[PDB]
Design a protein around this ligand. Structure first.
Ligand SMILES: Nc1nc2c(ncn2[C@@H]2O[C@H](COP(=O)(O)OP(=O)(O)OP(=O)(O)O)[C@@H](O)[C@H]2O)c(=O)[nH]1
Ligand SMILES: [Mg+2]
Length: 168
């Protein structure tokens, strides 16, 4: 096919803004007014230049986090979303991130980090989120961190463009 099919796995803690950011990737008439917490996971297909993303929108709730690893084997890229305003759980985000990295089915595929909710005045800056998560230690793998506002889409294209370049 003329469109390259790639699997994009979207993870991160509950309430980080995963589902909301994916809505920004859909055609405007297809975007949802409101989103609720994800139950288990759902799937979306989004066209992006020459690529067709099969998006695995995982719940970030603790009861569903064991589902994430069922989709590492076939993931071609990862979008790890973080609530920039949630300083308290950065260390939890980090723990889940490391379990993902160490998993024997996760290959060395690109990771896009969204520092989501940049609009909130309590938002930690991307550089500090990078420090809390230990991202500079990730040397075997392309990665990038971009601040985003999932409500407006600000930063979303910038992050996705970087990811698309990596998968083309
Ligand atoms: N202020 C602000 N709110 C946001 C932003 N992104 C998402 N939200 C809001 O944050 C809440 C959580 O967003 P979701 O997209 O449901 O988060 P999620 O990561 O998919 O949550 P789970 O499915 O439970 O894992 C929703 O009320 C969103 O409207 C943002 O960038 N800024
Ligand atoms: Mg969700």
């Amino acid at each position: 096919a003329a469109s390259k099919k790639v699997n994009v796995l979207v993870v991160g803690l509950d309430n980080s803004g995963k589902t909301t950011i994916i809505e920004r990737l859909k055609p405007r008439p297809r975007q949802a007014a409101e989103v609720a917490p994800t139950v288990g996971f759902t799937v979306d297909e989004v066209e992006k230049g020459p690529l067709t993303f099969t998006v695995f929108d995982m719940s970030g709730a603790g009861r569903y986090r064991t589902l994430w690893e069922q989709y590492y084997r076939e993931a071609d890229a990862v979008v790890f979303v973080v609530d920039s305003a949630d300083k308290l759980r950065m260390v939890v985000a980090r723990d889940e991130m490391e379990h993902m990295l160490k998993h024997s089915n996760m290959r060395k595929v690109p990771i896009l980090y969204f520092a989501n909710k940049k609009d909130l005045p309590v938002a930690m800056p991307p550089v500090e989120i990078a420090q809390a998560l230990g991202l500079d230690d990730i040397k075997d793998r392309p990665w990038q961190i971009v601040p985003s506002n999932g409500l407006t889409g600000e930063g979303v294209d910038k992050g996705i463009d970087w990811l698309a370049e990596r998968l083309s």
